[PDB]
Design brief:
The structure is cut from a larger assembly and holds one copy of chain A (about 500 residues) and seven copies of chain B. Chain A has 20 helices and no strands. With about 500 residues, chain A is mainly α. Classes of the chains: A mainly alpha (about 500), B mainly beta (about 50). Chains in contact: A-C, A-D, A-E, A-F, A-G, A-H, B-C, B-D, C-D, C-F, D-E, E-G, F-H, G-H.
């Protein structure tokens, strides 16, 4: 059948972007080293893509209304394949940044355009099934990425991270051409608004730069961050004022007039903020405070996909007899349970299993959060506008993810510093079981200064674990309050 | 308010690390953990050969 | 080895700098423990406050040199003396929370 | 080198401070070890309770330092004694869990 | 051996952050080797097997 | 003072390690308090101002 | 060299800790560099190659 | 200098571990200054440049 092949193709189209997003952050250390640059210098390889993608995502609908959805999809896929190949064969950090910028600008129309095509092409008899299948690919790729990324980083020369996308793009283009022939989309020509584009570019770029660079510059203690935040806020304010008054919609804000859309967008954005701000810490915690490797660290998040890979069809099959709101509430409760589980069970000598059961539990929470909330988000809208709504949803979700990461990292480091301060106090003279430690250390031949450094390192590790567990507790508590918001949405679902 | 509270309290006491005034080798040990010993009681004994 | 007399025990209460003010010597105190729960109370008095915050005599930097500086509210210990007629019937042990 | 006798051995319990209010010297106790499963039940007796929890004898004592969002409960090791007739039949080793 | 790995550690496992979770313990066993075969295929200290 | 806190710390900072992130430095400065008002309002060592 | 880096270290890595995960082991190997060419291109201690 | 910093460090660097990752090394260089300029704008140990 053509439907199944099309489903596979669009799943791959939305899978490649997530794979590329997740793999680079894992591979950044070795890539930075091989090109004679530092971690701060190399981390620009991620901020550039972030800014480019952030700009590209909101603009999907404008190009959709003119170029044509199918043509845009095909052209974007081929261009992304070419850009990934170019990045893979780079030979300098600057050239890598350039090609990453191009790739990010190109890749914007993948996820929302793919979702819109899948939603429209499938007959309404199986809309729920199509949406259920789509949510899987966004829930499995983030874990399918880091394992392979680590294996490639530690075994073969980098560049094969950006080569795997070439065959995926080739298969996607071949299948899309062979399956979507004749299912064209109506187009329309309209005037171009310049102020809207300029304002969007400036504001969103400034916001992304501020979020991605705030940490190293100690946020508001650097004038650069201050000017960036000022320009960002001013640009966003003026743009928002303008768009509601603009005749030609560079961004279609009329969708916010629907109560369901507002509530769904807010809920998904905030829940995603919490999720993505939480999961980011675990890899770093394992690699730095426990000695894990990248491949082992990624392997600790495998048990999340065990549950969704099963329940996703079952939820899709039975969607006819469920009040989706109750699924969202259950998922929020399940996310609180998992984070409280992590909070009261992390210990310096915890085995691999101590950080694998909680993700097995989180599988349920992730499984029943994307499909229902996205079904509510796009409820009752006409078939033609599904593209713009998807673009808005994705833009908000990505913003939430970036914000969550930015807040969580700073909280982690600062609370680690506080705990370090509160701990190093006990290490003084006038204290038994403190000179004994020095005696045992000097027994092994360490100097006095080396022993002091070793004690300081141990205090640092303990502080990181305590600070990391303080963040999980806060996240779960915050979840407990976000529970009830999903009930404000009316039931026109369909 | 008229009161001040804190949960950062911990009971405290005295402790003495028994140490010998001379060097030598041990031949007896008169007490183990959780044993009541009175002042002036022998706790350890050494070889008196040297 | 060690010998731990079980007769004269006190409590070290760590208060923030915000609370240290308004505390004088001899003021009444009430201490409740966790092993005995709320079924038993203790009476005591302030003996005095310490002329140091613990970080005074530390042998290591309070924070790392590489990292930035973050403000942390300090704590200052206070000596509190318990009544000895309650210990003999409801004895304590070193390091219990209260 | 270290010589380790295999004749007399005991067990350190590490109970929570919130569950030692009712223990006494000589109360019976039963122990099952994870090396012999659930089919070899030892029997013992409570020799006594220690003074100093577990934080009091450590360089980095976990405590309810001001600013902590999660409260903590201390533990206090208590000492058990094993019947040697059983022990000789099923030898144990130091560090095994029960 | 007459003790697990943690019992006979070099430095004490530093005091946990306030949580404690049960984990399985491991006990060393001393396995001899046939010398006549080492000379054909030598080993070195620290190789996994 | 004639040196930064990091330079004259009880534990030196090692800047030639590749994993180096720039951070603004700090220099201690000594301030002389008046003793007449100290009697009225005593201060302890370690308090913050 | 007759011994892995994990062993032969200041603190020999302690297995049997109940939180053990397998990682590859690396054994140092010594290489003599032509001395007639060092004089034309001097090297330093700790330079990666 | 004759060492890349990581070689000459308080705590020796361990590279035969298994969790090793490649990072750029750094090599200190000695720079002189004109003393007359320092006469009117003095410096202190640890100031960045």
């Amino acid at each position: 059948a053509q439907l199944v092949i099309m489903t596979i193709a669009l799943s791959l189209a939305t899978f490649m972007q997530v794979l590329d997003s997740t793999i680079a952050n894992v591979a950044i250390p070795t890539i930075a080293g091989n090109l004679g640059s530092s971690l701060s210098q190399g981390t620009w390889v991620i901020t550039s893509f972030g800014v480019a993608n952030a700009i590209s995502i909101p603009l999907t609908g404008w190009l959709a209304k003119r170029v044509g959805e199918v043509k845009l999809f095909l052209w974007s896929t081929i261009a992304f394949a070419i850009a990934s190949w170019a990045c893979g064969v780079s030979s300098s950090l600057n050239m890598l940044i350039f090609f990453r910028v191009i790739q990010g600008i190109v890749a914007g129309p993948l996820i929302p355009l793919s979702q819109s095509l899948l939603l429209n092409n499938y007959p309404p008899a199986k809309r729920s099934i199509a949406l259920a299948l789509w949510s899987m690919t966004v829930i499995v790729a983030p874990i399918c990425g880091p394992i392979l990324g680590g294996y490639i980083s530690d075994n073969y020369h980098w560049g094969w991270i950006f080569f795997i996308n070439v065959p995926i793009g080739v298969a996607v283009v071949l299948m899309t051409l062979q399956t979507l022939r004749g299912r064209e989309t109506r187009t329309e020509r309209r005037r171009i608004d310049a102020v809207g584009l300029a304002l969007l570019v400036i504001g969103i770029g400034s916001l992304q730069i501020m979020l991605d660079r705030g940490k190293e510059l100690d946020w508001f203690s650097s004038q650069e961050i201050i000017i960036l935040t000022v320009v960002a806020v001013v640009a966003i304010c003026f743009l928002i004022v303008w768009e509601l008054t603009d005749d030609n919609p560079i961004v279609d804000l009329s969708l916010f007039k629907s109560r369901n859309f507002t509530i769904g967008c807010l809920c998904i954005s905030l829940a995603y903020m919490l999720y993505f701000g939480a999961i980011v810490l675990l890899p770093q915690l394992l690699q730095e405070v426990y000695g894990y490797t990248a491949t082992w660290a990624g392997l600790a998040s495998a048990p999340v996909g065990i549950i969704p890979v099963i329940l996703s069809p079952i939820i899709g099959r039975f969607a006819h007899k469920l009040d989706m709101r109750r699924l969202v509430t259950f998922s929020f409760i399940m996310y609180a349970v998992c984070f409280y589980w992590r909070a009261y069970t992390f210990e310096p000598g915890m085995d691999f299993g101590a950080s694998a059961w909680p993700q097995f539990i989180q599988g349920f929470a992730v499984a029943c959060f994307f499909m229902p909330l996205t079904t509510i988000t796009l409820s009752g809208l006409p078939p033609e506008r599904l593209a713009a709504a998807s673009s808005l949803s994705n833009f908000t979700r990505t913003l939430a993810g970036s914000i969550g990461t930015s807040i969580t990292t700073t909280m982690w480091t600062n609370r680690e510093s506080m705990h370090h301060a509160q701990l190093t106090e006990s290490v003084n003279p006038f204290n038994p079981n403190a000179q004994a430690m020095y005696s045992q250390l000097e027994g092994l031949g360490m100097t006095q200064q080396q022993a002091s450094g070793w004690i300081a390192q141990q205090i640092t590790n303990q502080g990181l674990i305590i600070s990391a567990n303080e963040i999980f507790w806060m996240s779960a508590g915050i979840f407990l309050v976000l529970l009830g918001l999903v009930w404000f949405a009316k039931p026109p679902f369909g | 308010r008229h009161f001040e509270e804190t949960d950062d309290a911990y009971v405290a006491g005295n402790q003495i690390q028994i140490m010998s005034q001379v060097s030598g080798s041990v031949t007896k040990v008169w007490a183990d953990n959780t044993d009541f010993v009175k002042e002036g009681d022998v706790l350890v004994t050494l070889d008196p050969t040297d | 080895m060690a010998v731990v007399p079980a007769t004269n025990m006190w409590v070290d209460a760590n208060f923030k700098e915000t609370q240290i003010a308004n505390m004088r010597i001899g003021q009444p105190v009430t201490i409740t423990t966790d092993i005995y729960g709320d079924d038993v109370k203790y009476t005591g008095k302030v003996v005095g406050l310490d002329m140091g915050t613990g970080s005074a005599f530390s042998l290591l930097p309070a924070q790392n040199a590489t990292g930035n500086w973050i403000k942390v509210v300090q704590r200052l210990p206070v000596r509190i003396e318990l009544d000895q007629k309650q210990l003999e019937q409801y004895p304590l042990r070193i390091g219990l929370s209260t």
